[PDB]
Each structure stands twice: as C-alpha cells, then as structure tokens.
C-alpha cells in the first residue's frame, strides 16, 4: 500500500540512516530485536510502508545500505538498533573513494553498482504498489556524492513515474574540512537537478547554529545533529502513515511546491524546539508554532530566506487541533509578510493536519519551503570552484580516470543557468 524504500550512502548517509531508523522504530513501537511493543492498534495499521514482514512476527526495514569502505558498515552494526537490518542488504566495496568524485563515479562506482542495483530492483518488485524513493547522502564526500548521484541516474532510467526525494548535505564555507569539496559538490549538483524530483538542502553550519542558541546545549555532538534531521525526515511523511483531518502524501507536496520542474530545491525546519530548562515555561499553542516556523534562523540551510521571495510553502501539522488555528494563522502570516511572498501566485501556502503527535509532544510542525533565496548558497559554492579551477589545482586526480575538462566547463554553465533562473522568477511582475 504505497510503500517507499530507503537508500543511504556514504559515511554521513549511514549515520543519518542509522539514527533515522531508531526514531521510526520508537514511533511504531519496535524494539531493538524487531518485536512490537506498542499500545494502540494505529501503530500497526500502516506498518508495511517501512517494514517488511518476516517469520516469527518480526519486522525488517526495507533499507539498502551502500558504501565504498566496509568500516562504516561495521560501525552501523554495533550501534543500537543494529540488528534490525538484514545482512543481505549491505553492499560494500573494499577500496574506498578517497574524497574523489571521479573515482566514485567512473572507476569504483561503475564496477560495483551492478550488485546494489540488483538489490534495490529486488526490493521494488516485492511491494504491491511502490510509492517512491528517498535518498540520504552528503554532497561533499567521495562515495556519497560520486556513486550516490550515479545510482539516482540509473534508478530514474528504469522507474520513470515514481518520485524521488533526496536529503542532501552540502558543505558550507564556514565549517569546511575538505579542500576538494568544491569540485565534487558542483559536479553532483548538475547531476542532481537533472533527475531528482525533490531535493532538500541541509547544512552542518545551520545544525550547529540551532544547537548552540536554541537548545542551549554547551557541547553538541554528531548524534545531536543527526537527531534534528531524523525528526524532520519522519515528519514529512507522517500523514501517509497515520490518519488525519486532511491527507497529504509525497506526491501531493511535490505538486503544490514545484511550479517549474527545474525549481525543486527546498528548505526544511522543525518546531517546536526548546531547551531543557525552558519546557516548563512555554505554552504550546498553534500561534507559537507558526511564529517559530517562519523564523529565519530556524532553517536548516545557510541561505537566509528574507533575502528572497517564497515561491511556495507547505506546512504539516502533527497533533490534535481545530482547523481554525491552522487556517487563520497561515492567512495571517501571508498578510503581514506580503513583501516576502511573490505576487503572481496568490495563496501560495498549503496546510495539512495529522492527529498523531510524537512521543512526549502534544503538537509538532514540519515545514518545507521553496524560495529563491536558496540561490545564494549555490553562488558561494560556485565562487570557490572558479577560484580553484582557473589555476587547475587538484586537477590531475580528476583527470586520471578519463574525465575531461569539458565536463568541468559543462558544470559551470548548468550551475550558473540554475542560479540565473531563480533570479529571473524572483524579479518578475504581473
């Protein structure tokens, strides 16, 4: 019944996938041994969307884990909830990418993708009616950006009608730890816009920004950042798994957020977020949630949305409330900020309600917004690329596997055209 499969690649993708499955398992009451522990029958009504059925009454996720170095898969197995994953779904290489886009996309990626493509093909056939694919990878790494984008190309070729969603982490210039990240970032971006139906940008800078100031925890770790992404990842597909006053699936959001097929880069945010010593002090209400939803510093991208115009926006409310709080507030926020919304598409915001809140919360909101202010992070990345490319620095590694400079030239033009297209639609009047 319109289930989706999960594919995760790279070290960053594996850690996002490792913690994401913990949240879903807790939401549906699945223990680390794969046995149901819940209280209500609603938690089992739509279990087939994420978990397959196995013997003995245990469930296994339909997630494919891929990497070019098996050390990541050894770590993901020894973590909590590590016994749920089926051992056959691990497909790994014994060489590694070495933070090289060319190696992971032409030499090692090409020779290994035959095995993983067989696994994902097998998973898709098992379901009665597939709904789509979701991808979790980082665009700054070697195997995640390199082979991850090639699998998207192959999957799109054989499954045209299905929708594809990507939670992509791009590197920000502030917190930078890889010298060769501008090369493999822009190359993936050109490939991503060609095939991916939906792309969701995530920045480690923004995740650090939220932790230091909002949650006010002194020493955050990568587990904390992975938790924020996992909370947002589960929220977008909540109404497909639970009943509600208003239904909405992944396809419905895509229809109401993509006016033009080349404009499919969104930003996400999660509310509410409170410190430990401030939960006793804040009253949880819909006006409070909506106020934080459009807060600029609440986004998970380095792009500031007040520098552009919201082409479209969507909100997915989780919890029990009346439609008046929802409908009135979205109307109110559009009227008070009419300068931040483009004019030629009136009523450019979508609302959905799901009546199952998360554990420990009475209300929660996941926000997905399409804005032209996202073009500025592409400009900053392209700024660093052209600075390094004119001197042909770190190029002999990229030319060593047959890839030629014309693809480098092609990447610049397509990236610049995407940036220009965002600018054109922002500066338009009826």
């Amino acid at each position: 019944m319109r289930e989706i499969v999960h594919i995760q690649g790279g070290q960053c993708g594996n850690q996002i996938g490792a913690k994401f499955w913990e949240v879903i398992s807790d939401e549906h009451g699945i223990d680390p041994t794969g046995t149901y522990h819940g209280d209500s029958d609603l938690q089992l009504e739509r279990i087939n969307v994420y978990y397959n059925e196995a013997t003995g009454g245990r469930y296994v996720p339909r997630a494919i884990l891929m990497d070019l170095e098996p050390g990541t898969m050894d770590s993901v197995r020894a973590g909590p909830f590590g016994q749920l994953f089926r051992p056959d779904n691990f497909v790994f290489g014994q060489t590694g990418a070495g933070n090289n886009w060319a190696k992971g996309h032409y030499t090692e990626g090409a020779e290994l993708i035959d095995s993983v493509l067989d696994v994902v093909r097998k998973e898709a056939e098992g379901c009665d009616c597939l709904q789509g694919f979701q991808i979790t990878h980082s665009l700054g790494g070697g195997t995640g950006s390199g082979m991850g984008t090639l699998l998207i190309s192959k999957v799109r070729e054989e499954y045209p009608d299905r929708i594809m969603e990507t939670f992509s982490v791009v590197p920000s210039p502030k917190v930078s730890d890889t010298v060769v990240e501008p090369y493999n970032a822009t190359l993936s971006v050109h490939q991503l816009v060609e095939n991916a139906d939906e792309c969701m940008v995530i920045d480690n800078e923004a995740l650090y920004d939220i932790c230091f100031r909002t949650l006010k925890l002194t020493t955050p770790t990568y587990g904390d950042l992975n938790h924020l992404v996992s909370a947002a990842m589960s929220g977008v597909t909540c109404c497909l798994r639970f009943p509600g006053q208003l239904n909405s699936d992944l396809r419905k959001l895509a229809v109401n957020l993509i006016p033009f097929p080349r404009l499919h880069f969104f930003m996400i945010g999660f509310a509410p977020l409170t410190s430990r010593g401030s939960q006793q002090y804040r009253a949880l209400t819909v006006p409070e949630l909506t106020q934080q939803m459009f807060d600029a510093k609440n986004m998970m991208c380095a792009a500031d949305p007040r520098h552009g115009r919201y082409l479209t926006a969507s909100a997915l409310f989780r919890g029990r409330m009346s439609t008046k709080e929802v409908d009135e507030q979205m109307l109110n926020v559009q009227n008070k900020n009419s300068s931040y919304f483009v004019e030629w598409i009136p009523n450019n915001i979508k609302s959905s309600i799901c009546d199952i809140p998360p554990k420990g919360l009475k209300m929660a909101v996941t926000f997905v917004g399409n804005s032209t202010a996202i073009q500025e992070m592409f400009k900053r990345v392209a700024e660093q690329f052209t600075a390094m490319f004119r001197r042909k620095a770190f190029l002999h590694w990229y030319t060593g596997e047959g890839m030629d400079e014309m693809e480098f030239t092609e990447a610049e033009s397509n990236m610049n055209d995407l940036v220009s297209e965002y600018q054109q639609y922002q500066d338009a009047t009826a």
Binding site: R276, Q279, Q280, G360, L361, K362
Partner: protein, 199 residues
C-alpha cells in the same frame, strides 16, 4: 511530557497557614492548651455523636480565645466538610492541628499505660495517676515560676473533679499526646515522661 509535570489539582488541599497560626497561638497558653481544645469539643458536644454544626464550631473556637474572621472559617470549613454535610468531624480536626505522632513516642506511651496498671493489677484508676508523678518535672518541658505546691492543684484542676472516673488506654494515650504538642522536641517529651512515672 516526561520533562514537565502538570501539577494541577485532583484533591482539596490542606488550607495551611490558618492551621499553622492556630498551632503557634495554642503553644502560648500553656502545656495543657491542646487538652482544652479537645476538652471544649467534648463538652460542647454534649450528645456524643462525633460531629459539630456550623455555629457550634464557631463557639468552640471562640471559647478557646481565637477571634478568627469569616474568611478564615470559610477556608477551614471548606476542607474539613468536603461535600457540605452540614457537620464537621472534630476528631479529624484535632489530629491535624496537633501534628504527627512519632511511633517511638506512642509506643513508649503504651508501655506507660501497662506499667501504671501493673501495680494496680491491670485496672487503671485516676487516683494512681495523681498518686505517682513528678510535679517538679514541669520545669524541664518549659520553665515556670509557680511553686510545686500549686502544681498539684493545677494538674488535678485540668483533670476532672471526681476521682472515680474510668479511664481507657486510648483516652490515656490521647492525653499525653496533647501535652506533647506543646513541646517541639520529641526527646524532651520522652525524658519528661520517664521522670513523671519513674520509667
């Protein structure tokens, strides 16, 4: 939400400060003030039913010497008469104003009842109590200037005039617990009890 408790109310709370003010004021009259409050309720309740009405409770408080205002009565009467029967059980009220008895003190009181009945053969009589006690022990619980000669009359004046009144162990244990409420130290009361009955 595990992080935050919802407090709120599911049961009517003890009013608090009006009871505390009564307890502090009662300590000023003397060691037998708590006896007077229990004595007043019993003597005002001439019919032995176990409850008092609206006006009767006003008289008992007024008889002791507390001129509580209308609001203070409303708060006190609200908790003790929960569903408005029109009557209030004085036995619960006296227990709360006195405080909490420590199990050690009550057990020592129970043995004191047995010890005083031992010499009499198991029968408790009021002559025995007024025959064997230490009037000079009044000083240790609180200093006083009254002579020991007048202390004997004060002890029996608080007691009944007749010397043939039957006593029960529950009536005996409630007698000394009332005196205990005057002193703030459980140890101080215990060492006074040993001096009085030679135990």
């Amino acid at each position: 939400n595990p992080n935050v408790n919802p407090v709120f109310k599911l049961a009517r709370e003890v009013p608090s400060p009006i009871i505390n003010k009564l307890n502090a004021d009662l300590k000023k009259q003397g060691p037998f003030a708590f006896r007077s409050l229990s004595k007043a309720c019993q003597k005002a309740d001439t019919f032995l039913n176990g409850s008092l009405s609206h006006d009767e409770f006003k008289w008992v408080i007024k008889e002791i010497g507390f001129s509580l205002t209308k609001t203070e009565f409303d708060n006190l009467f609200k908790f003790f008469d929960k569903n408005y029967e029109g009557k209030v059980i004085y036995s619960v009220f006296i227990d709360l104003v006195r405080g909490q008895q420590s199990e050690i003190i009550t057990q020592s009181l129970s043995q004191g009842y047995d010890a005083l009945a031992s010499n009499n053969g198991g029968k408790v009589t009021v002559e025995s109590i007024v025959q064997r006690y230490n009037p000079l022990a009044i000083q240790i619980i609180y200093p006083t200037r009254k002579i020991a000669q007048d202390l004997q009359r004060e002890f029996v004046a608080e007691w009944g005039g007749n010397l043939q009144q039957q006593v029960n162990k529950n009536a005996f244990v409630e007698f000394f617990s009332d005196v205990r409420a005057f002193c703030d130290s459980e140890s101080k009361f215990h060492q006074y009890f040993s001096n009085a009955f030679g135990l």
